[PDB]
């Protein structure tokens, strides 16, 4: 009735079994009751006090853990390492020779028995593969009609009209790379095309990635995971977009290059780029075939000014009754007039708006203005400061609403705030302003005035 246990290590044609038990690898004459085939390399076996097996059973469920490094060329042996970087070679259990082995996983081993019994799974859930539901639509974007229609043609049409591309044998673009001065709104349309796709379903899926998010193991882990998740979410027949913001994190590139060249195995996914620096990106990405379509986003002009302001300056916000009486209580007409006035003033070439003095290679001097270095984020800050001044005035004085003078003060103030604040210069802006004359620059200063690093 009492009985010990052992683990099989080898078998012979003579129906004799090698068993590890009592810390010793003995050879045993198996009982004729059981067969010679159901015995498994790594199978626990009962033993009698006469030291003879009477049963072949299950596999060990508890023991030392290790990480698999290599499967030996023979195929029956695995080279693994332990807790304190102790490394050993073991054999494999029959279940190991319910998923197949992937070198780099974890195994359950008994070092004294020298046998691995089970691939033990360790899983960590990553939030990067989690999709994102975009929030802002094209009604929140202004002064980008040409570029928004370009992105419409280059992104939403292939998903909506795959069959038209098929019958015309036109390969849809695979990589779109936006570029523009910082604060123009690249991210806005980049994450609003996903809303456009979601609304254009007569199930869109977006997955955002940030450079600082993937600038920290190392970063190359998540690229394969996100690409595979996109491949899975695309093979089901649904549109999907992977978005890479701030390509400046890239120049590692070659793995991404290989993956994007393999992306041609898929036909309903586009990687969308975005950057403030065209130069700093690795040009191999920009080579046609991987990232083909380029779209420039421009600093808003005078026309785009009132258009983008109207987006922030809705009729919802309170306005002082004097302004309403100025146009007989017509909110639309009065707000249109005031936004026209403020965009004219901010785009006017008054002495306050004087920003930059250029020192060309031939010494040509021009007094530039903030109206030439404007951006969307500047408009956001301006309207925010206008609202803050208006609410302070309402609190202190009592009358509610908004007035033009608030914006007039905010616009003249905010230039000083952003003067010391960074992103006030860009090499592309210098190149664009110098293209008219064709002369380099070595001296830059503002016009309150501060120097610039050139």
Ligand X SMILES: Nc1ncnc2c1ncn2[C@@H]1O[C@H](COP(=O)(O)OP(=O)(O)O)[C@@H](O)[C@H]1O
The torsion angles phi and psi of 353, rounded to 5 degrees, stand at -70, -10
Q: Check binding of 237 to its own copies (CB under 8 A).
A: no
Buried b (16+ CB within 10 A) or exposed e, 124-156: eeeeeeeeeebeeebeebbbbeebbebbbebbb
Among 34, 36, 51, 412, binds its own copies (CB under 8 A): 51
Nearest approach in angstroms of CB 245 to ligand X is 8
Among 37, 62, 202, 448, binds its own copies (CB under 8 A): 62
79 annotated binding-site participant: no
Among 41, 186, 229, 371, binds Mg ion (CB under 5 A): 186
Q: Check binding of 235 to Mg ion (CB under 5 A).
A: no
Q: Check binding of 385 to ligand X (CB under 6 A).
A: no
Helix (H, G, I), strand (E, B) or coil at 352: coil
Residue matched to tokens 């978005």: 243
Q: Cβ–Cβ contacts within 10 Å for residue 97, how many?
A: 12
With contact defined as beta carbons under 8 Å apart, do 93 and 117 qualify? yes
Enumerate residues 135-194 that contact its own copies by CB under 8 A: 153, 157, 161, 164-165, 167-171
Rg (CA), the chain: 34
Q: Which of 6, 12, 7 is nearest to 29 (CA)?
A: 12
Residue 354 half-sphere exposure, CB side, CA atoms within 13 Å?
A: 14
Q: Rounded to whole angstroms, how far apart are CA atoms 55 and 50?
A: 14
With contact defined as beta carbons under 8 Å apart, do 357 and 366 qualify? yes
Q: Which of 221, 274, 224 is nearest to 249 (CA)?
A: 274
Nearest approach in angstroms of CB 183 to ligand X is 4
Enumerate residues 360-399 that contact its own copies by CB under 8 A: 377, 384, 387-388, 390-392, 394-395
Q: Check binding of 187 to Mg ion (CB under 5 A).
A: yes
175 binds, among Mg ion, its own copies, ligand X, none (CB under 5 to 8 A by kind): none
Q: Check binding of 184 to ligand X (CB under 6 A).
A: yes
Q: Which stretch binds ligand X (CB under 6 A): 135-143, 205-213, 249-257, 384-392?
A: 135-143
Q: Rounded to whole angstroms, how far apart are CA atoms 252 and 285?
A: 12
Going by their DSSP bridges, the two strands 354-360 and 441-446 should be labelled as antiparallel
164 binds, among Mg ion, ligand X, its own copies, none (CB under 5 to 8 A by kind): its own copies
Helix (H, G, I), strand (E, B) or coil at 264: helix
Would you give the binding string for its own copies spanning residues 196-215, x where CB under 8 A is met? Answer: ----------------xx--
Would you state the structure tokens that stand for residue 73, as one six-digit string? 């060329």
Total residues interacting with ligand X, rule: CB under 6 A: 17
Q: Classify residue 128 by its DSSP letter.
A: T
Enumerate residues 240-279 that contact its own copies by CB under 8 A: 254, 257
Q: Check binding of 46 to ligand X (CB under 6 A).
A: no
> From residue 14, how far is each of 19, 30, 42, 65, 122 by CA, in Å?
15, 10, 19, 34, 41
Among 67, 106, 137, 187, binds ligand X (CB under 6 A): 187
Enumerate residues 303-332 that contact ligand X by CB under 6 A: 308, 311
Nearer to ligand X, 64 or 213 (CB): 213
Q: Check binding of 185 to ligand X (CB under 6 A).
A: yes
Q: Check binding of 147 to ligand X (CB under 6 A).
A: no
Among 41, 186, 299, 406, binds ligand X (CB under 6 A): 186
Nearest approach in angstroms of CB 387 to its own copies is 5
185 annotated binding-site participant: yes
34 binds, among Mg ion, its own copies, ligand X, none (CB under 5 to 8 A by kind): none
Q: At what angle do helices 220-235 and 253-262 cross, to 10 degrees?
A: 10
The torsion angles phi and psi of 381, rounded to 5 degrees, stand at -65, -40
62 binds, among Mg ion, its own copies, ligand X, none (CB under 5 to 8 A by kind): its own copies
Would you state the structure tokens that stand for residue 209, as one six-digit string? 């990635």
183 annotated binding-site participant: yes
Among 31, 36, 59, 65, binds its own copies (CB under 8 A): 65
Q: Check binding of 448 to its own copies (CB under 8 A).
A: no
Q: Rounded to whole angstroms, how far apart are CA atoms 247 and 226?
A: 16
187 annotated binding-site participant: yes
Q: Which stretch binds ligand X (CB under 6 A): 139-147, 340-348, 383-391, 398-406?
A: 139-147
Enumerate residues 71-110 that contact its own copies by CB under 8 A: 72-74, 76-77, 79, 82-91, 106, 108
99 binds, among Mg ion, ligand X, its own copies, none (CB under 5 to 8 A by kind): none
Tell me the Ramachandran region of residue 165: left when phi exceeds 0, alpha when psi lies from -120 to 50, beta otherwise: alpha
Q: Rounded to whole angstroms, how far apart are CA atoms 94 and 157?
A: 52
Task: Summarize as ranges the residues that interact with Mg ion (CB under 5 A).
Answer: 186-187
Sequence ranges of the binding site for ATP: 183-188
């Amino acid at each position: 009735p009492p009985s010990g246990y052992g683990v099989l290590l080898a078998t012979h044609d003579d129906d004799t079994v090698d068993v590890f038990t009592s810390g010793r690898k003995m050879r045993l004459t198996c009982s004729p009751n059981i067969d010679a085939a159901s015995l498994k390399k790594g199978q626990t076996v009962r033993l009698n006090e006469a030291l003879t097996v009477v049963e072949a059973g299950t596999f060990e469920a508890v023991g030392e853990i290790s990480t698999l490094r290599e499967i030996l060329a023979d195929g029956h042996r695995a080279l693994v390492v332990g807790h304190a970087d102790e490394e050993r070679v073991v054999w494999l259990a029959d279940p190991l020779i319910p998923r197949k082995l992937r070198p780099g996983d974890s195994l359950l081993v008994d070092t004294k028995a020298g046998y691995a019994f089970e691939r033990i799974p360790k899983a960590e859930v990553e939030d990067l593969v989690l999709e994102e539901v975009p929030d802002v639509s094209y009604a929140d974007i202004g002064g980008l009609s040409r570029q928004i229609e370009q992105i419409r043609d280059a992104v939403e049409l292939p998903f909506l009209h795959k069959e038209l591309y098929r019958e015309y044998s036109l390969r849809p673009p695979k990589g779109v790379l936006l570029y523009g001065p910082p604060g123009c709104g690249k991210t806005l349309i980049a994450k609003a095309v996903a809303n456009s796709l979601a609304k254009k379903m007569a199930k869109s899926y977006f997955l955002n990635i940030k450079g600082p998010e993937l600038l920290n193991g190392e970063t190359e882990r998540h690229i394969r995971l996100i690409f595979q998740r996109a491949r899975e979410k695309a093979s089901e027949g649904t549109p999907v977009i992977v978005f890479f913001d701030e390509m400046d994190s890239i120049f590692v590139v070659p793995q991404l290059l290989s993956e994007i060249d393999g992306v041609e195995g898929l036909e309903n996914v586009i990687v969308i780029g975005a950057s403030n620096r065209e130069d700093m990106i690795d040009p191999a990405i920009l080579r046609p075939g991987r990232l083909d379509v380029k779209i420039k986003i421009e600093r808003p002009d005078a026309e785009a000014a009132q258009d983008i302001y109207s987006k922030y300056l809705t009729e919802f916000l309170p306005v002082h009754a004097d302004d309403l009486a100025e146009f007989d209580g017509d909110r639309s007409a009065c707000i249109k007039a005031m936004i026209e006035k403020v965009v004219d003033r901010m785009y006017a070439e008054i002495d306050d708006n004087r920003f930059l003095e250029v020192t060309y290679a031939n010494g040509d001097k021009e007094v530039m203005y903030f109206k030439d270095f404007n951006s969307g984020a500047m408009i956001q800050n301006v309207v925010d400061r206008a609202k803050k001044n208006a609410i302070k005035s309402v609190l202190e004085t009592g009358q509610p609403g908004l007035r033009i003078q608030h914006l007039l003060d905010s616009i003249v103030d905010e230039f000083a705030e952003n003067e010391d604040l960074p992103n006030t210069t860009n090499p592309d802006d210098w190149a664009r302003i110098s293209g008219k004359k064709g002369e380099r620059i070595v001296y830059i200063r503002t016009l309150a005035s501060r120097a610039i690093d050139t």
